[PDB]
Symmetry: C2
Subunit: 211 residues, 2 copies
């Protein structure tokens, strides 16, 4: 018995997959329309990445497996919308409150209903260090992006990013549609990086201190 | 009891660190001199990365921990030299034998003696996808690179890379001093990527099939 607490640093480990189009390619996207959005209060923001997880494991900083799950430990701070359907609850977020003019936020969601396949046009981007900054380099404009059906109770991650931010509880939520300070690579690791064909993880808790 | 076999896919997980100079920055280097080298038979090749691991764990593709260690399972296929001192044994290698004109090889070493601090000038590089290819972008020329003392029996990883290759058993060993095909990102994951401040892993076995 090793329960995660609301103070725990929790990793979402497993085999990550993004949208059918860059298989195994960690990618970001800028939707042409507002098809998938994080909503909370007055905020409606377009997400820039959606990632599903097979073989999910909740791990701590030392890769020891937690015996409970985030739903139940962390309270909901928002929702993910597909069009105007409220399809998922945002459970917790990862990122930094360190002051920055540009940044990104990770969000752990859980499908609240069975979610049906959806698709959308988007520009596809590859985030990569560039000589150092985190460069969001455009790959190809106007590609169709599909997501398979996501069952109920299925966890998944979304990302938002931009040069504006608002807060939800302590979470700093970046938004808008780019070069981010290299500082952000820690918060997007190990998820974004070279490959989703090999297993990886995303931190799902705020301000992860790996020290 | 879950022993790795010579047929096992084995991940080296832990907190990785490279040379004191890019803290937490996954980097490659091109030594100015032949200070650290992989040697085997007639081959003497300059390594392009050396990575130490704290909190090491041997994991399988599903992040289940092996109960034995690579030394003893895999046979030695070469050595790491610091100047002309034979300081480590290469136990196993990761990479691909898929035909390519440019590539990289990972090597799991084990210090065979207590190894003393060493330093060397090198150009420092950041490997990153570039719009797609794996670009080895130069950061800064002529930086001093230090490695702390490495005890005996300490595991560590070295990398070689280039547009030439030779084989040692089935291992394809890339060498010379760059744009690599994006195919290579899988084999360098999750090690290379955004951050070594968060825990990560390198595959230490040949032709990892994560499927």
């Amino acid at each position: 018995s090793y329960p995660m607490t609301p103070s725990s640093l929790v990793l979402m480990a497993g085999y990550f997959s993004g949208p059918e189009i860059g298989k195994y390619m960690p990618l970001l996207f800028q939707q042409n329309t507002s098809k998938v959005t994080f909503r909370s209060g007055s905020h409606t923001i377009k997400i820039v990445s959606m990632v599903l997880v097979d073989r999910l494991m909740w791990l701590d900083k030392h890769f020891n497996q937690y015996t409970n799950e985030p739903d139940g430990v962390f309270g909901d701070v928002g929702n993910v919308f597909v069009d105007n359907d409220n399809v998922a609850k945002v459970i917790t977020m990862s990122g930094s409150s360190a002051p920055a003019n540009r940044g990104a936020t990770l969000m752990l969601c859980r499908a609240t209903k069975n979610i049906q396949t959806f698709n959308f046009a988007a520009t596809v981007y590859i985030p990569a260090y560039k000589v150092v900054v985190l460069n969001v380099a455009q790959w190809e404009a106007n590609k169709t992006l599909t997501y398979p059906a996501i069952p109920k109770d299925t966890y998944f991650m979304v990302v938002t990013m931009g040069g504006a931010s608002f807060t939800i509880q302590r979470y700093v939520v970046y938004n808008e549609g780019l070069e981010l300070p290299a500082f952000w690579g820690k918060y997007l690791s190990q998820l974004y990086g070279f490959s989703w064909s090999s297993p990886t993880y995303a931190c799902v808790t705020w301000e992860p201190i790996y020290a």
